[PDB]
Write a protein that binds this ligand. Structure first.
Ligand code: NA
Ligand code: NA
Length: 303
């Protein structure tokens, strides 16, 4: 006997009729955690903390936020070793893993598109045969970067680079305005298989108007993955806004939208799940979790 794992249970994921489904074609919802930036909080990303999250929080997906700028991969490519550590841990543990090319201050994904293609080609060649892997090719386009003129052309360069090596694993594409404007993507979608579009919300800033954009996008037949959300405001402060977060969690459950919460770190942001000094290898009791972490853990443990 053994504890069943998410990948053992669900295998290769795909997008069918605008919905994430498993190898049996049955709907599946991933719920898990995102790291903070690997260049700052990578110590919290390892096989022990991922196993603890799987066993104690019930997560089935873990997202590694590999920043490009801000001391990330472009200037310090050694952070790729932490991505590889996390992917290999996810394989060992039967977990899904999101490899996130985490643009932010570099608000146009085209700025580092050559590095992105080479990085994703390497990851897809090494790990593309494993069902665990999900690619997230540009975290948050922002600042007036548009879908039709900037993001979609970027995706049309990166998707084939991945697909040449990994024909079937899911690719998630960011959307305008810090991955809010999923309606723009829905109106001009990528015509390739197993593509999803990212939506990011922060409960202290975003509410019904953003849920309305999501419902519009879903009505056009595209699939949405909330690869990042926080209980704080958009800037990482305030709250945590648990009443509004619950409305968002109930919405995502109703729409069978998968999600990852920011962040698995002890950063001085109210979205951070851990108290200062919490062990980087897991084993956290209630007192090691922030107000946000306690709530998120409870929500992932629910059915
Ligand atoms: Na594959
Ligand atoms: Na994204």
């Amino acid at each position: 006997h053994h504890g069943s794992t998410p990948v053992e249970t669900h295998g290769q994921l795909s997008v069918k009729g605008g919905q994430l489904v498993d190898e049996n074609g049955k709907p599946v919802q991933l719920r898990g955690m995102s790291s903070h930036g690997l260049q700052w909080f990578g110590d919290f990303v390892n096989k022990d903390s991922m196993k603890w999250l799987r066993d104690d929080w019930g997560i089935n997906v873990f997202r590694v936020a590999m920043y490009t700028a801000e001391g990330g991969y472009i200037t310090n490519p050694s952070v790729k070793n932490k991505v590889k550590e996390a992917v290999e841990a996810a394989i060992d543990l039967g977990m899904y893993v999101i490899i996130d090319w985490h643009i932010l201050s570099d608000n146009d994904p085209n700025t580092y598109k050559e590095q992105a293609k080479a990085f994703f080609q390497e990851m897809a060649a090494k790990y593309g045969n494993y069902p665990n892997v999900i690619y997230e090719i540009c975290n948050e386009p922002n600042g007036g970067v548009t879908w039709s003129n900037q993001i979609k052309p970027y995706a049309e360069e990166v998707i084939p680079a991945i697909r040449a090596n990994d024909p079937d694993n899911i690719i998630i594409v960011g959307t305008p305005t810090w991955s809010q404007d999923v309606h723009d993507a829905a109106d001009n979608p990528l015509p390739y298989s197993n593509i999803m579009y990212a939506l990011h919300f922060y409960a202290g800033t975003h509410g019904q108007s953003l849920r309305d954009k999501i419902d519009y996008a879903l009505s056009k037949g595209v699939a949405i993955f909330v690869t990042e959300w926080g209980t704080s405001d958009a800037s990482g402060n305030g709250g945590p806004f648990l009443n509004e977060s619950q409305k968002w969690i109930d919405f995502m459950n109703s729409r069978n939208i998968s999600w990852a919460n920011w962040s698995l770190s002890d950063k001085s942001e109210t979205s951070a799940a851990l108290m200062p000094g919490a062990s980087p290898t897991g084993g956290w009791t209630d007192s090691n979790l922030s107000a946000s972490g306690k709530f998120v853990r409870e929500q992932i443990r629910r059915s």
